[PDB]
Design a protein around this ligand. Structure first.
Ligand SMILES: [Mn+2]
Ligand SMILES: [Mn+2]
Ligand SMILES: [Mn+2]
Ligand SMILES: [Mn+2]
Ligand SMILES: [Mn+2]
Ligand SMILES: [Mn+2]
Ligand SMILES: [Mn+2]
Ligand SMILES: [Mn+2]
Lengths: 282, 282
């Protein structure tokens, strides 16, 4: 069973969320299996950001056991702005562990290098998830986002426990049960950084959402890039901390890393500056 | 100075918010002056529901001093559902005190009786308001909503402290600085109750937002209806509690009413059922 270990208050620089496997901290990047049920195409998704929130939380590549922490820009805590008609993130957002968008190679389909991070997942179920939650989802499709010129695929998925899950089997079903969502998803990733002064992003395939099979191929591909990385065979690992406690066959395996993680110190959320309330009409 | 006296925890049946004037509870319906600046037409708006929230809090007509209490449905707290692409309410929502949508007569403009409540206000500023907040706003326009067949005007307004207030002077400026807000406003009020089993709402004037001049005229007439009501001259007050502590000339004036209100008993917000998370595509 996976649980979370929180250090500090949310919305502070000291906030860290470690994922625990049976009470013991494990690497959120390397120790959680990508597949919950391989042949049935059920995956383990690590949730970073709950729907309708702004704090840009992410699994950190540079710290041991890769806790989830808030991203920073110029020494300041990072928050995504509200762009009409959306309120913060419009999906439960996270990544698939044991995957890597290889920055060392130009990807053929997008003609750009990867963004140096596990592949991204948009979970569309009704329930709002929590930071550090490990959930089982099934893939429905995938969108080729070129984020600031880098390959940054967005997998469309759904918690297997969602009431609609059995009725969603491929990308065509998303438009059927969630009309307008794919259109709103394309728009969201194109414009979410404009309030920060960044240019609009673009999508390959004219923003088309590829089907489940295509999505599976990309996922497995990024999983193989991770296999190379964790074996220590990448030409450039970019300072990613490869410490893990469940892969004894790897050179960075260390059972003792778990014991070095500090105990939980869950404190009440810190306040967020009122400027984050603002709705941008871009 | 207007402050708030909170009884209980937010999101519970016992939650009440009384508005205080210099430390003394006053009627949120009758004792708060409609105009903050009559010559400049600056109005006092009582905030019921903050933007992006769901609890349907309202000024209560039947309780002494008319505190803000959450509406209920079948013994349970009433929450408005999230209808794609909106999250809860898309405006800071409230009312103008000392106004009344008269249910005893059919309004010439819409040919329907009033909904028996203070006229409604949509405040479009960037900052998220708080329940029980008395804010000064300028009127920009008005929409003729026929809610379940009753005259239910919606005044469009903005906090005079908003950074864009100087630039917004009439209805046309809303589309100029908040493109799409009006269309979204039209859609929100048409569909927000479909998930509750209600039929879609309608708008007179083809759902067009009338200008400031027009709005001022309607507010004036609802203010005159209230003047009749508070005087005890309405043919039927529908059981509304007309107790007030600032209008000596009225038969229901009673200064001791402030003293009967118990002291503030603020508690931390109570959790909201996860079912409220659900996004409806209707
Ligand atoms: Mn990032
Ligand atoms: Mn990511
Ligand atoms: Mn990105
Ligand atoms: Mn990414
Ligand atoms: Mn009502
Ligand atoms: Mn109202
Ligand atoms: Mn109504
Ligand atoms: Mn009303």
């Amino acid at each position: 069973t996976y649980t979370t270990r929180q250090i500090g208050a949310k919305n502070t620089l000291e906030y860290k969320v470690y994922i625990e496997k049976d009470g013991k901290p494990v690497s959120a990047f390397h120790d959680i299996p990508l597949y919950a049920d391989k042949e049935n195409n059920i995956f383990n998704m690590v949730v970073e950001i709950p729907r309708w929130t702004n704090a840009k939380l992410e699994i950190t590549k540079e710290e041991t056991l890769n806790p989830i922490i808030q991203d920073t820009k110029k020494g300041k805590l990072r928050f995504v702005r509200n762009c009409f008609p959306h309120h913060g993130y419009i999906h439960n957002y996270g990544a698939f562990p044991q995957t890597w968008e290889d920055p060392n190679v130009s990807h053929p389909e997008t003609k750009a290098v990867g963004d140096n991070d596990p592949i991204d997942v948009l979970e569309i179920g009704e329930t709002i998830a929590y930071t550090g939650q490990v959930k089982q989802v099934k893939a429905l499709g995938i969108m080729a986002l070129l984020d600031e010129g880098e390959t940054d695929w967005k997998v469309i998925a759904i918690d297997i426990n969602d009431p609609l899950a059995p009725k969603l089997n491929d990308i065509e079903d998303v438009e059927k049960y969630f009309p307008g969502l794919l259109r709103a998803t394309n728009e969201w990733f194109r414009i979410y950084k404009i309030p920060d002064g960044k240019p609009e992003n673009q999508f390959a395939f004219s923003g088309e959402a590829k089907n489940k099979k295509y999505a599976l191929d990309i996922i497995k591909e990024t999983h193989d890039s991770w296999k190379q990385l964790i074996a220590g065979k990448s030409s450039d690992s970019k300072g990613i901390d490869l410490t893990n406690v469940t892969l004894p066959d790897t050179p960075t395996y260390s059972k003792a890393a778990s014991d070095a993680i500090p105990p939980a110190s869950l404190k009440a959320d810190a306040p967020i500056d009122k400027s984050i309330d603002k709705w941008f009409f871009i």
